[PDB]
Amino acid sequence: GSMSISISYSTTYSGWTVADYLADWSAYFGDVNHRPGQVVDGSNTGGFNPGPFDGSQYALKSTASDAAFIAGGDLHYTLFSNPSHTLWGKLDSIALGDTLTGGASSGGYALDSQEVSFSNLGLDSPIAQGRDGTVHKVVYGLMSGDSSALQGQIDALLKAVDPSLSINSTFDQLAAAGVAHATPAA
Numbered sequence: 001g002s003m004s005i006s007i008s009y010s011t012t013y014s015g016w017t018v019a020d021y022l023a024d025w026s027a028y029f030g031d032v033n034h035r036p037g038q039v040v041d042g043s044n045t046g047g048f049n050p051g052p053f054d055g056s057q058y059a060l061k062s063t064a065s066d067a068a069f070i071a072g073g074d075l076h077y078t079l080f081s082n083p084s085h086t087l088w089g090k091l092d093s094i095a096l097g098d099t100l101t102g103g104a105s106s107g108g109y110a111l112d113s114q115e116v117s118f119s120n121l122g123l124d125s126p127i128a129q130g131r132d133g134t135v136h137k138v139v140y141g142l143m144s145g146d147s148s149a150l151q152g153q154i155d156a157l158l159k160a161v162d163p164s165l166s167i168n169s170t171f172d173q174l175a176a177a178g179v180a181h182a183t184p185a186a
Helices: 017-027 127-134 134-144 148-161 173-176
Strands: 006-010 049-050 054-061 067-077 087-103 108-118 123-125 180-183
Touching: 006 173, 017 067, 017 108, 017 134, 017 148, 017 173, 054 087, 054 108, 054 173, 067 108, 067 134, 087 127, 087 134, 123 127, 127 134, 134 148, 173 180
Parallel strands: 006 180
Antiparallel strands: 006 108, 049 054, 054 067, 067 087, 087 108, 087 123
16 A cells, blocks of 8 residues: 555665665665764765755765665754754655765755665654654664664564565565565666
8 A cells, every 4th residue: 555665676686685685785885973073074964955954855975885875755953952963754765775966956866876765664753752763763874884773664564564574575575575666777
């Protein structure tokens, strides 16, 4: 249905498990070190579309590799305001791959090589939860080289489509189950 997770994957990853893909992606993107004393504007801040502190997208390129992600939904960052340094709101999608392109003035961010995406995530975290919100933990994991939170949410959403499905399923198995959709290889 309209509430079910939808997954896209490059045909290159048809035989991969979701868990194996995300464990490698997290390590390949690495940790941009967006932390006190380590924030480097233009290196590890990323950007909102349209911003400056809110967007339908938040996007970041790795400082270690060409990896980039785009978080899609209705996202808000509190900067210094209580609860400080919280990303909250609606998270509908995560897109993973290489070579971040576009922006607000281009009609939105896209990956020139999108490898995998997760859509209809249905995540909604209120400001009052601060950095304990699921949206914050899912997206901060992508900043910091630990996609555990994202992996857990995908695993729960798959089990809701059908209890035989998990992040240990291959993309091809998820395609057979009607959840995943192959996209062109780089």
